[PDB]
Amino acid sequence: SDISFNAIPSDVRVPLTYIEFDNSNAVSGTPAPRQRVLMFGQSGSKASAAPNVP
Amino acid sequence: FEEWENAGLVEDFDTFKEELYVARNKDDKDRLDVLCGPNLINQFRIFAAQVQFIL
Amino acid sequence: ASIAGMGDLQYKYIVMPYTDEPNLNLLRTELQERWGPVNQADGFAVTVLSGTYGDISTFGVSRNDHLISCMGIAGAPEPSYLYAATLCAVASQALSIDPARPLQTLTLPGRMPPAVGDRFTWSERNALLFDGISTFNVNDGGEMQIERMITMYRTNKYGDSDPSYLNVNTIATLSYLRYSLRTRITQKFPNYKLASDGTRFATGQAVVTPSVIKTELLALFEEWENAGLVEDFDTFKEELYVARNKDDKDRLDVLCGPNLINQFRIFAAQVQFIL
Amino acid sequence: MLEETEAALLARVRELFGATLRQVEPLTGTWTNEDVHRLFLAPPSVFLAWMGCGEGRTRREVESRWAFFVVAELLNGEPVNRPGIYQIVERLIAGVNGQTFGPTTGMRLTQVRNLCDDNRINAGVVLYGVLFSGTTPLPSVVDLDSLDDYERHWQTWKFPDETPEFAAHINVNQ
Amino acid sequence: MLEETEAALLARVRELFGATLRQVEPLTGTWTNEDVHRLFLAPPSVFLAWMGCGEGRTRREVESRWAFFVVAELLNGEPVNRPGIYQIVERLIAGVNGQTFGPTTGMRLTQVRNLCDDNRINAGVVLYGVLFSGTTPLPSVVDLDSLDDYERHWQTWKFPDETPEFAAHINVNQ
Amino acid sequence: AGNQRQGVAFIRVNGMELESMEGASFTPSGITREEVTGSRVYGWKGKPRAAKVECKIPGGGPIGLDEIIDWENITVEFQADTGETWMLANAWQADEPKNDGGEISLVLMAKQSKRIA
Amino acid sequence: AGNQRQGVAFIRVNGMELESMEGASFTPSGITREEVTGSRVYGWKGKPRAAKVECKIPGGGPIGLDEIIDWENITVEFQADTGETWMLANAWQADEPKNDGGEISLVLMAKQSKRIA
Amino acid sequence: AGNQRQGVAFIRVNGMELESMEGASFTPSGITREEVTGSRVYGWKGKPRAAKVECKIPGGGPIGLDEIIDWENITVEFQADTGETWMLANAWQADEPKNDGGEISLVLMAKQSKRIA
Amino acid sequence: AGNQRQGVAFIRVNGMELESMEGASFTPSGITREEVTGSRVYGWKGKPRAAKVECKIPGGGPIGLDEIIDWENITVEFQADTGETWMLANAWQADEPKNDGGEISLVLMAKQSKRIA
Amino acid sequence: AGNQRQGVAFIRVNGMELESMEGASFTPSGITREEVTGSRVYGWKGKPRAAKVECKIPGGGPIGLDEIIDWENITVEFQADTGETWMLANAWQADEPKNDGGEISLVLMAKQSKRIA
């Protein structure tokens, strides 16, 4: 679940190669216990994140 | 089991060793009862990729 | 609410753009509660303040915390929080690679420097460094680079000057040493039994003597020195002292002093030409 | 420990033969010329004696030495059951050699001696001596329960007195 | 020095058992057949004897040899407390082996002997012999305080008599 | 002590004192000096040396052999019975470990040893 | 056990326990670390190792010598009397087997041994 | 590691790790600098170089010799035991392969190698 | 076999197995790839190769030396002890045959070898 | 010192002391004198020479091989253990660097070396 996949079902059984193109440049979700940082910032309207929740 | 693993059929050894159990039968007196569990190796079927072009 | 809902994880670096007294007081309280020997979840905060030189100097003099570092900038085309985020990212990466290497020439990518007439002179930068405000520099091109990162700590408890807790490298090194000592103690001695020095326990038993902890601390100090964090060994060995507690009977008290290594900052030269 | 080894050897001897031997008892001393007269011999019987020790491989262990004294009765110049005596000796050798009894490790058969001389034969007693040797480790002078655990390790980093302290209160366990 | 070693061994034995042993006293000679009659035996008890010495590794040290004689009482053919005797022997071996007493270094257990024969058994005495050996260094014939310090070193360089002298008055210390 | 000489030595790894046999060796880390001769005798020449600790451990003890053969970064302490102590840091187990009749030989080695206490 | 040390060792091949003499060796399979010095001491360097079991068998026993000299793919089990056990799989008989005065030396060797039980 | 030096090297072709002998060579691809002197010493001069990997493989292994002599476009990976890795892409088998007493020499060569990981 | 490596090799000429010494060579017939550099590294270039088999035969054996020096059209079979086999057809005896202290060197050569079986 | 001879040498590049093996060479930059004979012996003749420093570095060390193969303008310092020091400025890495079994050979070369200190 480290890589968030779009339009690729999680239950696929056909043995082949699945290749997708996505414009956004995501960052690998490798855990870094010694490099955890926190940021404080304001969120404008049309936000989908609950306030005061990391 | 070591021979099987070297042949490329089973993967995990420590779990197999910990789940092994060999005992005699208390009724037959000539039959040995063993309960083992192997971890059959997986196959490479699905290769999911995501390409993030920059242009 | 946000500071109450952070959780219990160890956030080593914190980005706070709000430079106001009511918020910074709560942040300082939480950080100094985490910095104590009880919580042991070390944390650091990086802020950037935008304003005139006098306002920056006044703010730096006003704040006297050893867990917050602020960088002053005047006439910045970009908002302050962008600079704060970039500086925190660069500092976090550099200190995670090595806690003792100074932050002297690292550049901030994508941050536009102020105008030529809005940059601080040498005297202003020196006064800001003496006032607990970090300073930056402009590369030969259009790049903006870190100059020196220091904390807000300026004054001793009684009111005198104090050079301790000044460089961010000091805090980073102290945190790394505490983490390494905790890991070594919890790994080499998972669960043992305590006995007084001089008792005859003999082979086989899993007991620990203050001499054992002495030797383990000496070995860990050797590893620290080889890693490039501490310099003097004989003084550290002579100042070590390990003893049991006469009341708890299950607590071992140790008092050690390390000699944090120095950094190469100033290169003073004098040229005597003959012509 | 020696008492555990002696008890284990006695129990093994008792379970090896059971009703064949009349008694299996420990012995004081190795054997003397007056033992045939001062002892309650009930042939067949087996006596166990501890013939001191020796220098071990470490300073925490010693090489103990034991001996078995099988006693049999001869009547009119002939043993009562010669095959029985031979079987008893062979089974005693084969039931102790190589096994571990208590803390003792790997009993080694040193030699078997024939102790039938004028003193024993004139009393109608057939005696054989089977000698073993094992590895008995010494105990510890101080028990664990007397001393308590190492749970907390508190360290304070040296700094000027009027500065914010840096310390670590580490719980060694959990 | 031998007196210091003997005192240290006696003190260690006394503190090891305390009230369990009735007495802990030194012994003259190793052991004789009349010792069971001429001695004030109070079983259980421990006797310490110095069984001479040997050639050491240097000319300033010798390899001393010591022995412990635990005494126990047997009543009606049986020891009073056999586990007690075994525990006493094991603790004596484990409390002296490897430790240093006075100037002596690293006591080594040579062997343990069973001394229960007709002479001792007929008197109702159980005797075991535990023998050690250590490193006792010899003292010095001349003490330091008899001779005085070397403080001044005056040197005169040879020259013709009627010339300005060259000399050095050196204070060795300070 | 006043006249006490070294009779036995104790070796402790990560705080656990090892059940060592008699005759334990110890080679300090320093400079090994050689001999130089041409037409005459000229002097010496140096060569680096590494600290070594050698001993024997009985089999079947509290410390298993698999633990012994897996020591890469350990702390070794060599202490004489008189009071002389040497500390070896970041040591490792060298050579081939063998269990010959209940005897396990340890060749614990380190790149630098200093005399503490 | 509580204080029990290893006094004897048992070797079993394909389930048959071997009549082994005193002093049976065992070398675990792992990495042999060497020593590196140039102008100073720098560290160690690894080298693979193979498991070995050595013992002696009296002549005229239940297991013939022709069987011994024909072991190419066997299972060897090395167990100490205290309870430590090592398993060698797909082992083979190495070196030259000789019958010297009723003594047959076995150099049973394998490429990997793991400590079971 | 902290003090670990290179003792062994692993070579992998198309994912199959090769059974390599001791003493495996590796020449990185770069510029070879020569020496220039006329009336004085002036400087150096460059010359292109190609990556090379050399090793030996025992005969009768899983990988046949016919496969070895037919490698024109393969991927070669040279990894040290400490963790240093080099990747060779579109490599080929150069020189004459010979089976001398069960020894097969590989001269796997490529026109460019970069240090990955 | 499962783990068996090549230890010995057998050479058979016209069905007669040769009494070969230790260290028998074998060079398969194929393409030898060279190295091409100009201002940079460009690639490789091919060159044909011929199969070669080399060994040594003791003197005074069943096969005479006159027979050896007269082999123009023979069949040579190179087989490893593990099971790898190569066949050389229409081979010939090359180079100078010499009987040096009971040693006769054979340089049996052919223009093409294929791996049968 | 008074009688101390050179036993080891230290090589430092840009301040980093190199992990050098035994037997490090050093050729000073100067004039190489040849020999001239016609009908008789007449004298010598000069030829310029370039400074050279040669050593070996274990693989997997702090300094990577890619860094080694990319040295064009560096400062090399050759110091003997007795105290003799030579400085090479604007040096470069010459010849072919190879990693042969964990051994990397350096042929650091410069056009002029002067004896400082």
Residue numbers in the entry:
A (entry chain c): 2 to 55
B (entry chain b): 441 to 495
C (entry chain c): 221 to 495
D (entry chain 2), E (entry chain 3): 1 to 174
F (entry chain H), G (entry chain G), H (entry chain B), I (entry chain A), J (entry chain C): 2 to 118
Wording from the paper:
Myophage Mu is a representative of contractile nanomachines with a simple tail baseplate. It has the capacity to infect a range of intestinal bacteria and has extensive applications in genetic engineering research. Using cryo-EM, we resolved the three-dimensional (3D) structures of the G(+) type phage Mu in both its extended state and urea-induced contracted state, the latter lacking the baseplate, at near-atomic resolutions. The structure of extended Mu can be divided into four distinct regions: the DNA-containing head, the connector complex, the tail, and the baseplate.
